[PDB]
Amino acid sequence: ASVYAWNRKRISNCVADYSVLYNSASFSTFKCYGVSPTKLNDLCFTNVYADSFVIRGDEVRQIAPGQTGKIADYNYKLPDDFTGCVIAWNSNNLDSKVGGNYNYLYRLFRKSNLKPFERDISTEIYQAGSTPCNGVEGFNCYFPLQSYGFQPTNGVGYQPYRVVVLSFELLHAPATVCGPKKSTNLVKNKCVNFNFNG
Amino acid sequence: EIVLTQSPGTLSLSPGERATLSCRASQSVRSSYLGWYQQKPGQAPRLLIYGASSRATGIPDRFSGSGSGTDFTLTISRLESEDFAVYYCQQYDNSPWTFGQGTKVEIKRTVAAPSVFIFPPSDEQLKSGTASVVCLLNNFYPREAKVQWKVDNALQSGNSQESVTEQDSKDSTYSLSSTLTLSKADYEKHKVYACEVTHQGLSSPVTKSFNRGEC
Amino acid sequence: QMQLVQSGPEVKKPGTSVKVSCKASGFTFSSSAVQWVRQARGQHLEWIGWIVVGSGNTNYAQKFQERVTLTRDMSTRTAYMELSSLRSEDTAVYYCAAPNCNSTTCHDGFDIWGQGTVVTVSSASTKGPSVFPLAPSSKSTSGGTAALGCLVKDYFPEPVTVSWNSGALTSGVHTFPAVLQSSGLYSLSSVVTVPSSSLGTQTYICNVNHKPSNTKVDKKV
């Protein structure tokens, strides 16, 4: 989806294999705020939210707590105490076409900065003057959505990047989304120090 | 895609009297998108009225536009010496943004006399192989006045360059000089050249002439 | 301070393409819009086009639609206009104008203006002026106030700065605007009013100036 209408998916009731997505050797950027990524399979939470969208390579810096710009102020904001991960990689093969791809947009004009995890799809004409717009474009009445010029011959600076943000929410619920548990071989007829499931 | 005829063509009033410019559009426009600008001689224009009825910032309180439906107005409710400039109306509607012709305001002064003057050629020029005669008019009012050329009592309509200086500040008149350029072949075959003026402050044209061979 | 600072005067030849720029300073340039207009000498203003700083959308008039481009750079806050397929009918002063905006909502009319760049189109080569004596005729005036002055012919390109007495005596003089002729060279004349009693008893020398050829000359008349 576009960054201004990012898509959320709620993941629950399943055994997440976090350390396998860690070592894909595919993701250019992998960060984890508040949770160390080497200990992901032993801390388990109630719900995990996944948010996916597409931005350009120079704006990936903005997808982080405490950052400001155009993406972090009008499109997608993360709180100060975000606990989760941000994963991004370069998808110039799928999201750009010779001459450009004109199906990915981003909001450019807004009255005020977005609150954390707020999604807006309103397309009313932005009033940049004190003049009522009455829905007809012109001077001081601009359309708020600007397209991306995704051209395959750019640098990596303007090259498209796909971003997935995982939000590990913990409410006071018995934490259904837990990771895998290694189960060693079974040995018999020796004084052993067993630990069965419980 | 929009016709903005501006009235009046020129404005001629003394410092203190009141003026009413107007911009007339040949189709409807909305008052929120018409602006009046002022340009003083030689400088960049400065915005005066935006929204057809709202003043700008820094403009005096005397200035005030009106801005009706499609037929817009501009009332200057007292004229200073600062006030003489050119004024334009622009429209911001989606069609090609157009300007008016622009109205010029001049100070009403007394009808002065355009003293006809002449200057013969010079040997410095007649060493270069050329010819040029200039007939001068100075300190007259109003601007409108015409100079004609005589060459052995005949006109010359091609190769007549006329220029006029902008209105002065101290006396507030105009002074225009017209130059008539020839070849030293031409000036070597003809003798007598003449010019005259037509203006309101006088009754008949007055002649300042000269004849070749006598500097 | 709220201002636009524009580039310098340019001289180009027909068929080439010209590029002019103006840099914004003193306000939030990232939300405003910039319009470009032009003006001949003493003629009406003509609207060239306009552009939005943020999105970059542009609009041009029908006359200039196929031979102008408007661009901008947010990094240095600069606006550019390129005009191509030149003609001799494009010698004029160009202005860029924008409204004063600060980051939230902003003004409803083009309040800020540049100082304008002068663009000359001529295939004539850069030359230098010549100064000629407007003879005061011995009896052109009865002892009232008489005319005497200077011709200046064949100078290109503009401008030429004139004076008398090293600039000292300035009372009563009229320096005429330049005139563009067939030969491509401009021509202005400067005149003074002094009686015939002066011409034989008062002294005057004429001063002319042109720096692109460093020209300082004096002509007794």
3-state class (DSSP) for residue C94 = strand
**How many Cα atoms are found within 13 Å in the side-chain-facing hemisphere of B118?**
26
**Total residues belonging to chain B:** 215
CB-based contact B33 A139, cutoff 8 Å: yes
CB-based contact C108 A129, cutoff 8 Å: yes
* Contact criterion met (CB below 8 Å) for B199 and B140: yes
CATH of domain C130-220: 2.60.40.10
Prior bond of B142 cis (ω within 30°) = yes
All structural domains of chain C with their residue ranges:
3-121, 130-220
Residue C142 DSSP symbol: S
Most B CBs within 10 A among C111, C183, C199, hence the mutation to make, goes to C111
> Could you tell me where the beta strands, DSSP code E, fall in A62-159?
84-90, 105-107, 126-127, 141-142, 145-147
Least Cα separation, residue A114 to chain C (angstroms): 14
CB-based contact A129 C107, cutoff 8 Å: yes
Q: What angle do CA A71, A77, A82 make, to 5 degrees?
A: 135
* Contact criterion met (CB below 8 Å) for C216 and C208: yes
Q: Cα separation of A128 and C55, whole Å?
A: 13
Q: Cα separation of B171 and B158, whole Å?
A: 33
Report the Cα–Cα distance between both ends of chain B, in Å, rounded: 59
Backbone angles phi, psi at A28, to 5 degrees: -65, -45
Chain A residue closest in CA terms to B92 = A139
Of B57, B78, B107, the last residue of a domain is: B107
Q: In sequence order, what are the residues at sequence separation of 6 or more whose Cβ sits closer than 8 angstroms to the Cβ of residue A167?
A: A48, A49, A50, A51, A82, A83, A84, A117
* Cβ contacts from B onto C, under 8 A: 101
Of B82, B107, B132, the last residue of a domain is: B107
* Cβ contacts from A onto B, under 8 A: 12
CB-based contact B124 C44, cutoff 8 Å: no
Chain C residue closest in CA terms to B90 = C47
- Burial zone of A80 (CB within 10 Å; 0-12 exposed, 13-18 middle, 19+ buried): exposed
Same domain assignment for residues B102 and B139: no
Task: Write down the architecture of domain C3-121 according to CATH.
Answer: Sandwich (2.60)
Same domain assignment for residues B82 and B127: no
Residues of B in contact with C147 (CB under 8 A): 117, 119, 136, 138
* Contact criterion met (CB below 8 Å) for B46 and B55: no
Same domain assignment for residues B154 and B72: no
Resolution for this model in angstroms, one decimal place? Answer: 3.6
Output the domain CATH number for residue B65. 2.60.40.10
* Contact criterion met (CB below 8 Å) for C97 and C37: yes
What does R_g of chain C's alpha carbons equal in angstroms? 23
Same domain assignment for residues B137 and B168: yes
Chain B residue closest in CA terms to C144 = B115
Chain B residue closest in CA terms to C188 = B163
Distances (CA, A) of B95 to A127, B90, C99: 20, 12, 20
Backbone angles phi, psi at C138, to 5 degrees: -50, -45
Same domain assignment for residues B56 and B15: yes
Backbone angles phi, psi at B75, to 5 degrees: -100, 115
Its domain, for residue B147, covers 115-211
CB-based contact C105 A142, cutoff 8 Å: no
Backbone angles phi, psi at B33, to 5 degrees: -135, 45
The chains found to touch C (3+ Cβ pairs under 8 angstroms) are A, B
Same domain assignment for residues B101 and B119: no
Distances (CA, A) of A153 to A99, B176, C215: 9, 63, 54
CB-based contact B94 A131, cutoff 8 Å: no
Residue A155: CB atoms within 10 Å: 8
Place of tokens 């004063």: C100
CB-based contact B32 A131, cutoff 8 Å: yes
* Contact criterion met (CB below 8 Å) for A179 and A38: no
Q: Cα separation of B184 and C179, whole Å?
A: 21
- Read off the amino acid at residue A4: Y
3-state class (DSSP) for residue A94 = helix
Same domain assignment for residues B124 and B164: yes
* Contact criterion met (CB below 8 Å) for B120 and B71: no
Q: Cα separation of C101 and A167, whole Å?
A: 38
Q: What angle do CA C135, C138, C144 make, to 5 degrees?
A: 100
> Can you read off the two tokens belonging to residue C221?
């008349």
Least Cα separation, residue B94 to chain A (angstroms): 6
Residues of C in contact with B54 (CB under 8 A): 108
Distances (CA, A) of C106 to A112, A129, A130, B128: 15, 5, 7, 62
CB-based contact A109 C52, cutoff 8 Å: no
Nearest Cα neighbor of B198 from B143, B161, B120, B119 is: B143
Most A CBs within 10 A among C108, C110, C111, hence the mutation to make, goes to C108
The chains found to touch A (3+ Cβ pairs under 8 angstroms) are B, C
- Read off the amino acid at residue A144: P
Least Cα separation, residue A124 to chain B (angstroms): 19
Residues of C with CB under 8 A from a CB of A: 31, 33, 52, 54-55, 101, 104-108
Residues of A with CB under 8 A from a CB of B: 131-132, 136-139
Q: In sequence order, what are the residues at sequence separation of 6 or more whose Cβ sits closer than 8 angstroms to the Cβ of residue A193?
A: none
Residues of A in contact with B92 (CB under 8 A): 138-139
Q: Cα separation of C140 and B118, whole Å?
A: 8
Residues of A with CB under 8 A from a CB of C: 108-109, 111, 127-131, 139-140, 142-143, 146
Secondary structure (DSSP) of chain B: ---EEEE-SEEE--BTB-EEEEEEESS---GGGEEEEEE-TTS--EEEEETTTEE-SSS-SSEEE---SSEEEEEESS--STT-SEEEEEE-SSSPP-B---EEEE-----B----EEE---HHHHHHTEEEEEEEEEEEBSS--EEEEEESS----SSEEEEEPPP-SSS--EEEEEEEEEEHHHHHH--EEEEEEE-TTSSS--EEEEETT--
Question: Total structural domains in chain B?
Answer: 2
Q: Cα separation of C52 and C27, whole Å?
A: 15
Least Cα separation, residue C35 to chain A (angstroms): 11
CB-based contact B125 C132, cutoff 8 Å: yes
Same domain assignment for residues B32 and B119: no
Q: How was this structure determined?
A: cryo-EM
- Read off the amino acid at residue A175: A
Q: Cα separation of C153 and C210, whole Å?
A: 12
Q: Starting from the edge strand earliest in sequence, which strands make up the sheet with B160-164, in order?
A: B117-119, B130-140, B174-183, B160-164
Question: B193 - beta bridge partners?
Answer: B151, B210
CB-based contact B33 A136, cutoff 8 Å: no
CB-based contact A128 C101, cutoff 8 Å: yes
CB-based contact A138 B92, cutoff 8 Å: yes
Least Cα separation, residue A106 to chain C (angstroms): 11
What does R_g of chain A's alpha carbons equal in angstroms? 22
Distances (CA, A) of C174 to B119, B136, B165, C159: 16, 11, 8, 16
Residues of A in contact with B52 (CB under 8 A): none
Of B89, B107, B125, the last residue of a domain is: B107
Same domain assignment for residues B168 and B76: no
Residues of B with CB under 8 A from a CB of A: 32-33, 51, 92-94
